[model samples]
Target chain A: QVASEYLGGPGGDAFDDKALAQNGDITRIEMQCTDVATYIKLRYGKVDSRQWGWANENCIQWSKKGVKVVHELSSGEYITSAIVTYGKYVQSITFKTNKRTLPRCGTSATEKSVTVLIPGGLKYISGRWGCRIDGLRFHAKC
Target chain B: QVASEYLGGPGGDAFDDKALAQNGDITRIEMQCTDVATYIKLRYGKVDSRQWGWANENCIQWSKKGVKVVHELSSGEYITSAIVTYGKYVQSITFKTNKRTLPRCGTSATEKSVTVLIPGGLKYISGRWGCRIDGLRFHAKC
Candidate 1:
C-alpha cells in the first residue's frame, strides 16, 4: 500500500495550526511504500499572491523508501493545487500555482517543477512543474 | 550491444542532411538496446539568433524498452553545451542552452534542459535552441 503524511512550518496566523496553511512559507509531504525497491522524488511550488514579493523556495529529502517534499512560500503564498499518480513501477507528481514571472532568487524558476525516473526494485520514487520541479531525489531498495 | 538511429524532418538547408542541424524546428533521436530491459529519452532545443523569436518546442516518446528523444530549433540555432552522469543502476542526462528566457510557447523554458533517470542495464544514449546532442546511444551486457 502507499501512504502519505503532511507537515506545516512556521509563518503567519493566516496559516497557523493548519497542515496546509497560508501563515507559513514552508510545508512538507512524506510518502512511503512497503513493496518497492527503488524510489524517486519530485518537487514543485509557485507563488499565489498578486502582490510584488520574492518567490518562495521548495525542496525534497529522502529516507529509506520514504520521501519528504517541502515548499516554502511567502506569507501571502500557498499551494493552490497538487496531483499524484503511479503505475506498477513508476510514479508522477505535479503541483500548480497562480504566480507569474520567475523567482527573484536565481535562474532556477521557483514556479517550475521537476520529474525523476528511478529504475530499481522499488526502494523509493517522482515528476515535473509548469513553473518547474525545484528538487528531486531517489533511494535504492534495501 | 546498443544501437542508435537519427531521423531528420523537413526544414531549411542550414541543417539539412546533418545529424545535428539548424534548419527548421524539428529533429529526432532513436535508440535500441540488445541486452537491456528499460530505456529513457532526453530532448533539448534553443534560440540561436539575437532576434526576437520564440524558442522551438522539444519532446519525447517511450514504449516498452525504446525511447525517441526529439529537438527542433530555428535557423542559426545550435547546441552550445551538455553533460551526463550515472550511479548504481541509474543514469541521468542533462542538456543546457545559450538562451536566457522562457519559450513564448509557454512556461517550458527553452533555456533550460531536462534529465531523465533511466533504470536498468544499458547500452548508451543522449539536446539545445537550435538544440543538439554531440553524442548519444548505449550498449550494455547483462
Candidate 2:
C-alpha cells in the first residue's frame, strides 16, 4: 500500500485517516454540498471522522448546511474511482462503485480528473482542508 | 500519486512528512540505530524535523544516542528504494539510491520483501513508531 500525492485544494491543517481506516473498511461517506462542496465526513467501523470542510472567506472551520448527501456501500460494493473537480478547493466529487456510479457532489466548474483509487478497502484519507476542502488524497492499507 | 500501505511494526502514533517534503526534496536522512532502529529523522529544505527517537524503556518519545548515521544527497541524487526489516519494531533499513547503495542501518533479521519504491523524488515518510521504529512507508510527490 502506497500513499498518494496531495490532491484537491491546498490550504488548511493536514489530516490523515490511516489509523482510522485500519479499524475497518469505509461503510459510509457524507458530503454537504450545493453549488460547491463544503463539508465531508467518513464512517468506518465505529468511527465517524472528518465532518471535514465548510468553506468561507475566513478559512475552512466547521459546521455544515445545504444538501446532506451520503453514499453507503452494500455488502459487496466498493468504490472503484472518483471524478473530482478541483482547483483551490475540491468543487465536486462523484464515486464510481462496483455496482454503479453515484451522484456528483459539489459545484459544476473547474477541470481535473482523478486517478486516485482505493481498491479492496478504503485504507485512509490524507490531505489539507480549508473552508471547504483544500486538498485530499486516498490511501489503502496492506 | 497514491500511497503505499504501511510497512513495518504495528505500533506508534502515526507521523507524516508530506508537508515537509513539499518544502523540498529530501536532502538528508539521519538515523540512530544499534542492533535495532532506535530513531530516524529527515531533512528537506531547512527543516530537521524528527529529532525522532531514543526509544528507552518507555516508547517512541524523543532523544537519541548511538552512531548518528547520516546520508546526504548531492544536487541530483535521490533515493530509489528502501530495504527494511520489521516484526515488532523496525529492525533495519537500507537505502538504494540512483548513485549508490547506502550501508544498512539497524539490526538484521526477519523476512518480508518490499515492493515499495519512490521513483524520482522523496515526497515523504509516514509510519508507526515504537520503543524503536515500529513501521515506515515511503512516498513520492506529484
Candidate 3:
C-alpha cells in the first residue's frame, strides 16, 4: 500500500514556481492505488542555499513508502517545479506566481499510502493538490 | 467564453442492479478538447428496451450543429456512454450511473441534454452524478 503519511510530506510551498502565484493554489486530491507494490516519488526543483542534500534524500526516502507530504512557504520562498511519480506514469502539479512576489510551493499534508485491489485487469490511481493563498483566509480551507 | 457550465452540464444517476435501486454513481469528471471543431456525444441504454434509435437520432442531430448542448438524466434514466470528439479524435467521460429510480428518476425535471462546447485547446471539463438525497432539495443546500 502506498500512502502519503509515510513521506513526512511537505506542505503547499514544496511544489510551486516563483513566477506565478495563481496556478499554485491546490485544493485537495485523492488517489487510489491498484497494486500492492506501487511506488510514489516527488521532486521540488533546483536546490537552493536553504535546501541541502538531506531534503532531497529525505523526500526520496519517504516517497517510496507512500507517505503524504506537505511543505509551507512564506513570502520570501520561491519554487521552480514539483512532481509525483508511480509505476510508468508521472503526474506533474505545477504552479505560477506574479513577478513582484516570490511564489511558495508544496503539498498540503503528510504523505499517506493507499491500497486498492485490482479485481481482474484494471487498476485505478488518483491524487490531490492543495496550495497556499496569500492574504486569503478562505482559499485553503478545502 | 467556453466555461465549465458548457461541458457535461451536470446531474446523472445509476440504478442499483439488485433491488433495482440507483447505484454506481459518477461524481465528477475532467475532460479536454484540443481542436477547432470539438464536440460531445451521448449514448444511452434502457433495461426493458432494445431499440437505440432514440439516442442515436438525438446524437446525430447535435453532431450537425455548431451550438452547445446538455443532457440531464432522471433517477432511473441511465447514460450508457459519452464521447468527446474533435475532427478525428474521441475521448470518453466517466459514467456516473447505470439507471435512475422512481420518484427519483421519474421526475419531470429528470430528463436533460448534456452540455457541449467547442473549447479549443486542452482544458478541464467536469461533471457530477447522483441526485440530492432528499428529492426536492437544491443540491448545494443539502
Candidate 4:
C-alpha cells in the first residue's frame, strides 16, 4: 500500500503582526496506504463533499468585509448557524429567511430536532447544539 | 487534490449494529496541506475515530483480547507517557507506568518506570489515564 505522512505546525505570525511569536514545532499524522486509499478514506470523514453545509454558502455576498451570519429563528422551529472568522475576529452567518419552515412532523429532522445545517469557520458558541466539520459534505440516505 | 466518496446504507446485521444512532456520531482529525505548505494546519474534532496515547516510541498491536500495562514509580521524580493510533479502527493510545523505587537519595535506579506497551488484540482497561491507538513507533531524545 502507498503510505504517506501528513505534518502541520500552527501559523506563527505569517501575518505582519509584530507581537506573535513564531515557535515552529511540527505535529504529524503518519498515514500508510496508497494515494488511492488515503484519497478515498481521508477526504471527508463522511461521504459526499456536497453534503457539507457552509454558513457562507447562501447568506452573504462577498461585497461586505467582516460580514457575518447569525441566527434569528422563529418561535416554532430550530435553526443551525455558523460563525465565520476573519483576521483577528470572528462572526456568524444566521440561517433565516421568510421561506424557511419546520421539517415534517415524523421525519428524522423533526424527530431528532436537527432542524438546521450550517457551515465551517465558526463554532457553536450558543444554542443547544451545532456542528463543526473538518470538511464540507452532505449526508445522504444510503 | 484527489477525492472519492462511498456510501453504505443498511446492508446486513452489521449495518444496523454500526448505524449511527446518536449525536456526536464520530470524531476525526485531518491535515489540509502538502508536506511543503510552508505552514500546515492539523484540525481534530469529534466524528470518526478514537485517539490513543503512548509513552515513548513503541508499537501497539491489536487483537480480540485486551492488554493491561501497569505503572510503577519511585520517589521525587515523576514519570509521564503518550500514545497514538492509526488504521481501520483508527484507535489511539496513551498510558504511564507505575512507580518502582522509594523516596531516597543515592539510588542508581531512583526514578525507574517502564512503558508497558501492549500489542494489538489485548484491550486496556483501568482507572489510570491510558489512550488507545491503532499503530505507533517510539524514540528517544539526545
Interface Cα RMSD, each model: 9.9, 10.3, 17.4, 19.6
Residues B1-142 of candidate 1: C-alpha lDDT, one tens digit per residue: 2111211122211211122223333222222221121222322222222211111223122212322333443443322222233222112233333331111111123332222222222212321112222223322111
Candidate 2: tens digits of C-alpha lDDT, residues B1-142: 3344566766777778887776787788899866667778988877777655564644433423357898888877877667677666667788877799888887555656443445454566878765567777666553
Instruction: Assess candidate 4 and give its TM-score to the true structure.
Output: 0.17
Q: Which candidate wins on TM-score? A: 2
The clash numbers for all candidates, in the given order, read 44, 20, 75, 66
Cα lDDT of model 4 by residue, B67-98, tens digit: 32222222321212222222222233333222
Question: Which lDDT tens digits does candidate 3 get at residues B112-139?
Answer: 2221211121122222222111111001
Model 4 global lDDT (CA atoms, 0 to 1): 0.19
Rank candidates, lDDT, best first.
2, 1, 3, 4
**Candidate that would win on DockQ:** 1
Best by lDDT: 2
Q: Relative to the true structure, how large is the alpha-carbon lDDT of every model?
A: 0.24, 0.67, 0.22, 0.19
Which parts of model 2 have CA positions greater than 4 angstroms off?
Answer: A1-142, B55-65
Model 4's DockQ score: 0.02
Candidate 3 iRMSD, 1 decimal: 17.4
